[PDB]
Design an enzyme around this catalytic site. Sequence first.
Site, short mmCIF file in Angstrom:
data_model
loop_
_atom_site.label_atom_id
_atom_site.label_comp_id
_atom_site.label_asym_id
_atom_site.label_seq_id
_atom_site.Cartn_x
_atom_site.Cartn_y
_atom_site.Cartn_z
N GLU A 1 -5.08 -8.77 -0.86
CA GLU A 1 -5.93 -8.76 0.33
C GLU A 1 -7.34 -8.41 -0.10
O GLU A 1 -7.55 -7.51 -0.92
CB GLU A 1 -5.53 -7.63 1.32
CG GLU A 1 -4.15 -7.68 1.84
CD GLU A 1 -3.83 -6.46 2.68
OE1 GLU A 1 -4.79 -5.72 3.02
OE2 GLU A 1 -2.62 -6.25 2.98
N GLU B 1 0.78 -1.24 0.00
CA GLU B 1 0.00 0.00 0.00
C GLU B 1 0.82 1.30 0.00
O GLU B 1 0.57 2.20 0.79
CB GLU B 1 -1.06 -0.05 1.13
CG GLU B 1 -1.95 -1.28 0.98
CD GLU B 1 -3.07 -1.38 1.99
OE1 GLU B 1 -3.09 -0.55 2.94
OE2 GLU B 1 -3.95 -2.30 1.82
#
EC number: 3.2.1.37
Lengths: 499, 499, 499, 499
Positions: A275, A157
């Site tokens: 995810e 991220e």
Amino acid sequence: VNVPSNGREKFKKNWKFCVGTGRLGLALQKEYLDHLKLVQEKIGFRYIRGHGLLSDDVGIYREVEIDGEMKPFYNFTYIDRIVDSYLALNIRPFIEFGFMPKALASGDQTVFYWKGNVTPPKDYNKWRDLIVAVVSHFIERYGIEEVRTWLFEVWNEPNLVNFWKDANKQEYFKLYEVTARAVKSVDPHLQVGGPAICGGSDEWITDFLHFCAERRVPVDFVSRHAYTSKAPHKKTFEYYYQELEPPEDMLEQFKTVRALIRQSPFPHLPLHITEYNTSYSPINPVHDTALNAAYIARILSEGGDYVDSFSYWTFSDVFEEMDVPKALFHGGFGLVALHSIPKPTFHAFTFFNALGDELLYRDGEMIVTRRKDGSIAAVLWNLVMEKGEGLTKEVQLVIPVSFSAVFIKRQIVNEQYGNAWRVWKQMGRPRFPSRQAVETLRQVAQPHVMTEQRRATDGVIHLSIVLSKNEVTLIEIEQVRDETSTYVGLDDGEITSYS
Amino acid sequence: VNVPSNGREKFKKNWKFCVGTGRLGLALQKEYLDHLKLVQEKIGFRYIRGHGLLSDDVGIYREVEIDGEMKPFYNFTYIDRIVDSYLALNIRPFIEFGFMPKALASGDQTVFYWKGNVTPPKDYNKWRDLIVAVVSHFIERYGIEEVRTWLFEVWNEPNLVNFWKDANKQEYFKLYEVTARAVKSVDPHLQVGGPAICGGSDEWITDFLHFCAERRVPVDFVSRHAYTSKAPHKKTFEYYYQELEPPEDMLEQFKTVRALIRQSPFPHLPLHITEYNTSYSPINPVHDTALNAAYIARILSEGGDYVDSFSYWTFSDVFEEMDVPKALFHGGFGLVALHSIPKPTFHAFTFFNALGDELLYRDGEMIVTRRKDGSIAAVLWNLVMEKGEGLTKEVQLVIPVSFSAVFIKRQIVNEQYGNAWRVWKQMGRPRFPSRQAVETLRQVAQPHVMTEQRRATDGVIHLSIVLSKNEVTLIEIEQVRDETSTYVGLDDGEITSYS
Amino acid sequence: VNVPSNGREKFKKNWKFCVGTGRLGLALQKEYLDHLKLVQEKIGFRYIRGHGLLSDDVGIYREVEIDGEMKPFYNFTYIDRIVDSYLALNIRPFIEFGFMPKALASGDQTVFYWKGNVTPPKDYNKWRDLIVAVVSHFIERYGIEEVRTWLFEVWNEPNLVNFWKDANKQEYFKLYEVTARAVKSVDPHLQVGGPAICGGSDEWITDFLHFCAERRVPVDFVSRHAYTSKAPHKKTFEYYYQELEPPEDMLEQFKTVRALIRQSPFPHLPLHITEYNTSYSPINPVHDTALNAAYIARILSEGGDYVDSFSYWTFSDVFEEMDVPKALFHGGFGLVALHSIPKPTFHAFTFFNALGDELLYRDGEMIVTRRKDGSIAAVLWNLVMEKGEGLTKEVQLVIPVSFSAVFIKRQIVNEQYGNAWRVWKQMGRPRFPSRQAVETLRQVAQPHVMTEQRRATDGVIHLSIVLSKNEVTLIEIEQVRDETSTYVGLDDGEITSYS
Amino acid sequence: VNVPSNGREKFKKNWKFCVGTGRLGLALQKEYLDHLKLVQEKIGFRYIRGHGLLSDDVGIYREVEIDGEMKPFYNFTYIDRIVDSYLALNIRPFIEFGFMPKALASGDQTVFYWKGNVTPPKDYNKWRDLIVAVVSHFIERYGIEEVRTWLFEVWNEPNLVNFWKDANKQEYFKLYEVTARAVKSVDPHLQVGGPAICGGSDEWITDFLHFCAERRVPVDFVSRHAYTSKAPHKKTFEYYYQELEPPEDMLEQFKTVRALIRQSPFPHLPLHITEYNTSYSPINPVHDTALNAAYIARILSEGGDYVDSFSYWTFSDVFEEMDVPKALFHGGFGLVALHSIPKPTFHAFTFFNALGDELLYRDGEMIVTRRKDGSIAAVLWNLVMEKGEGLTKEVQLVIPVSFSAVFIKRQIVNEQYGNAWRVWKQMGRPRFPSRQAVETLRQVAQPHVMTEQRRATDGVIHLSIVLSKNEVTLIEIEQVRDETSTYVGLDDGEITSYS
């Protein structure tokens, strides 16, 4: 619903290619390993993906005083234990390089209760040397053949200021390139990829791929995260509560991203959703509910149409991003709660694990397959997101059948069965339950099973399946090869009270 | 039913002092040891009682040529293994001396598929020496203090022609005396008893004690078997079917035999019912049914009033008296079926195993106890012996309760739940089921669990319990110490689709 | 040496009352629990003593905002798991209250790589409430009877600046009084003690006991740590090397502290040596050697004459005070090395574990005992601290014995046998060895066994025993009850090549 | 001995293709499964071959009264458990059809303590249907693909009057034909063979293949047994002692037989030696000795040059042909003694199991191989059949080494090490030893391990290996990749008493 007798397409195994985990240092825990064993018995994922390989509790990178010079020292004591334990459970690392080891870090910004350092390295050659040393040690211990089946993502991220200083795009591209060239320098067939972004910033993927094409940097796959919760509308000292968008919103993310790749300079690159879950918070009670299971069933059913893998975050409540869990059910991401109590979402996965390869029928509420032995397996779900009190759904299935008779086994999880969270509340929500309360929750956490024999009139069996609110159910239909004629003289009417 | 808050009487642990087993040579089987581990985990018997210690598969008695003479050779290889494995599962032998080794037998008559010889010893001094050698080996290997806790029975059913040549009363008294004096001669604390007779001729018990009185023979207890089935009225190549008398007729048996002892020269002798079950045939399907479990429940609730122990025949379907079992469910005597599948009667026993010491109430259909921590545990049963169907009872319990918040856990076995025999019939009665069919039977064999929280208006809780035909149910009632006030701000109404 | 045939004195079990461990948070590791299971099978300690119960990885103490106010939250998730796992291995906590939870700390000073905070509480009443919450929890979960058997120490080495801000004696006395009184307020039979100091400042013991008398502070035992190493004279990036004093110097510490207590206002207080080893550094290679095994045997031999228990620091190399271990043998305190390889000292403990209660003979090089079955067990050791070389000692044992034939089993650990550290160096000192290299080190770590049958004249056997440098040896002498005459006609001379 | 650095020829795995077992009914024993697990961990056989599949304890064939007539009933309860347990231990059956079920037998003659019936069937159509039913049930439960890899042998030693009524050759050929044709009629790919004879009548193998060619009967392999003991010269009530021919005599049997096949109408048939050992008696003490290991080692080394498999009779002492074993070491055929105590011959097999594929050198006393990782593995043996004392051989291996530093590991079994038999004698030959005596014999049964580091002199390492009487030794030589320069500052001289 008229079920065709033949399929033509296959239902893919992409839905269990990978599962998420809390940070790698937690793999050293006995409780983590109990849960991974349960998950590998009942589901059987191929890969496992988590943060913290290069963080300091796993302990790889240290700087050591030998005379009057600091030198790098690589300590493989813990990750050798960890990866050994993975391979013993038939699961492989989906390696993620991060976060930044303290001694390498250029600044102090950290993320999480465990404080992974989220700044660039102060020296990129030290970073490459770290990457080379770790990949060479994997190949020394496990052999090149094994390590070529692994996957290597860079960072996590980077588009978010909490995860990467200033969400600095160009600095991430520099880290990506240094890491991917270091990996390819040990062995050219090691698969490396990125950028591991979460949603709402998809230009990163298009810029990422244009960068790698122009500068001739190896990329072997694209990765991206997918959630559907909005920002919490209510926080407690313990919980975030969040509204959820419908499952179509998530499937539209998969499809959006795949379309981005098709228009890029690497039109055929694999897409891995590294995810996903409903909520991105590890303290949102929705993850403990039957709603979560029924929600995730549509993703399992269709997700594989758009992506090469999608990794449920996570296999277990053994997790510390927001500190040690404060009660048994605390909103954690896990398929398995502490004490190896499966949640409703766990059963959704074991249900999809009974499906066959040959796909007979699929719609927004069910999937029907055919197994090699000829039997039929169907998973049905009744997702109901509104507050309602009695929202059942009847499904009638018409299954063609050459047999005389069929044995039907049905397993259900819903707001009543397979639902330990509801019983934990009837218990008074014990935070730290006794061993006896835990044995009761384990018993109650199992799916409700029902069975019947049915005679198959005119080639066809008629099945009317009533699905309560937020139910997921597996139905298995097998040929009865009746042995009863063999029992010459048998008469249950001769048993006291029977027939 | 208004349940008292205070007990006065205890409920005795007599109901699980002893359980029966197939012949001792079968304890060498891995499958036998699997079922025993299961039973010892969930029930916890103290003693185990079986035939064949001295028969030829266990191998103890041989004659060998030494120095031109036939001399005894005592081979302890197998019973050392067998007894070591019982003590490892916390269970001790209720030793039965029989049947007659072949090299000692005076005649040729045998019993069972495995041919136990049923004739007196050719030489009573050779028999005494065998007994002395066996008991002294037990002391050498296990120590005197361990062996003084065991019990010793002489022969089995000597009043039946099948079991003892001519059902010769005076010959049996003679074998008894030689055996009893042999045992006492090794150590004065070893407890010996008999006459191990079945139903229908209790004159044997008064004569046996008269013989012991007059000849001054040691007797430490009286042993007797009890069944309620009539001789078979229908036979198949596979099955005996028999009509059953009601459970009261078995409790009358216990009582009658206890009266006969109190009238005798040894009025305080322990009484052990060393076998009981509904049917005495190991091929009668009633043993596989929920009927058997409801019938047995009455016995477990009151049997302890009249006897010191009552030993269910048997803990397992690992059994060969009528040849190897011909189907999974074949009428066997066992609590556990092959592949460790528990039958309904197994659950009756695990339910009585959750009961407390303090007896609050008992009638012919329920037992209600209190545990040390203060919780209530009740077993209820609806035995229905007629072919009807409309024999679902309704029970109203009023239970005093100092708490105010109650968690109620209920477990159910009946014709629908916890019943593998019924699903096995839905499968087409496979004789030799697959691994997958066996896993399914294991799941369906689990009791159904229902739970709720209840507020206790007036310091009492009103429960209405529907019991279907031949249901046995455990109800456990425990204090909620509610932790939900510590969850400051908790609101399940903030979770999507919830309160 | 002539060994008296009868004993009089008993050899006490004090040597295995307690063992030390790495911080409690490490008990969550699968590796820790494997080592603990091995130590509990082969040695069987009663208590286990470690740091960090209150430190932040275990996670007990948190401050949480409950709408308007910062309030304590006590998270028992991890220590319930940890104490459950100790009790399943039959070992009990010797509770040490420490270190300071970060949220309670008054300053910033920390100790070790894991950063235990070492400053007094900001508020002594919050501390007291922590203590009451923890003890009350233990009672709720395990019961008062169980918790009464545990022991409770306050802090660790408060006389050293690294362990306690300023080594402030009066501040320590205050924390003690507050913690002792908090523990007594929960239950008066809980045993509390201190001051847990290291050597070289024994006026602390006399001052502590004077403080407790003057203020009537409950004290139930005294604790003290003992080592014999000088401060390191050589450091590497990985090692501390230290000179040792002879074992008599440690026994003199035990004796000296016992003398201080006898002159105090509490002359009968139990003395617990809560840590001991040769060296106090978890990175001193001496701990991996046969020297260490021969040195500690002397202490196991006599230490119990002076103290109520003495706790080897530690049972396992699962330890992080100086960071994650950088090679297989890295100077760790443990009896067991990573991969459950026992070091030489482990075998010294297993050898004392074969000794009987009855003490026949002891001197500075051996201990001889008689078991209840009549057999003799001796441990002998040849500690050689000098750089010497082939330093071989001879012992002659004249052992009284009625038997006539004897079986003798001898087990040897020395520089050659039972010594994985030596083979590890032969392997090139791999830091992170492969599985196959590990299976090898495990083989080689086994003590060498030798056996013989000896005919024993005059109710006496003559044993001549060579002991190599730093050897530890177990000798067991058992009666042969010869069964050879029973093998009529046996002749090994009839087997090809044999007699 | 100068070992070439390169090979060309491969040492084949024929030596571990199959292993023998006692009768298949014994596979239900827990102890049998313990021993098989040990053998499969450390040796890893592919097939297992035993008697009594069709005999009456396994219970397949029964005749049953259905209305008027006696009908066949096939009971698969036991062989399903047995074959399931084999495949769980990764071992497959070498099926042997025999002996004759009682209810099919045409006469009364039996063999062994367990009375396998040895007469032709009373009806060859019933036999055929038995064979068709057994083979079809295997395919039903396990699938055709699994069962195609099994081998099917017809009968056992039909050339011996004890094994087949009158040793009738033509009744045997008739049984063979009926059985071979029935197996093929189920599935033509199934592999069937014979005639399973013992030595001293190889005319049977030529008449067998003449019979199959002329009558066009399928044969897919030839089977025969090999032993080298002469008739017993001394018998005891419990032993046969026998003189042994040299190991060459057995290799000459293998080579003789393979030449018969090459000159026959089926020149390319596999040859399986379906039983071999030194003595064909299961009560000859030679089997428990180090002589037996050294003898068998020459066979393992060369046997594969002549035959496709050679099956050691047997993996374990769990055996009953001559009754239950009367003592721990009783001359039984097994590699593993009761209580899972490996005999010396067990270690010969584990030693060959360490050998690599590439053959470097072999003569009559040694074999030297190279593994894939480059390391070298050698087995050496010193077979001494005469009675003398010091009968030591010295072997000097000169090994070509591309390394520079070498780690050498040697394991030894001889009259002193790895020899529980010698120790059992020092203990007074206990017949039925205690748990402690067994634990001691298990420790003593482990091979002796010796290690060293050696500098490679000019391209070579010189090894001098002293082999005592009847030793078998494994030596492995592996490159040291030295990590010592990594330990900057390391000095064992700084450890008290060391370098």
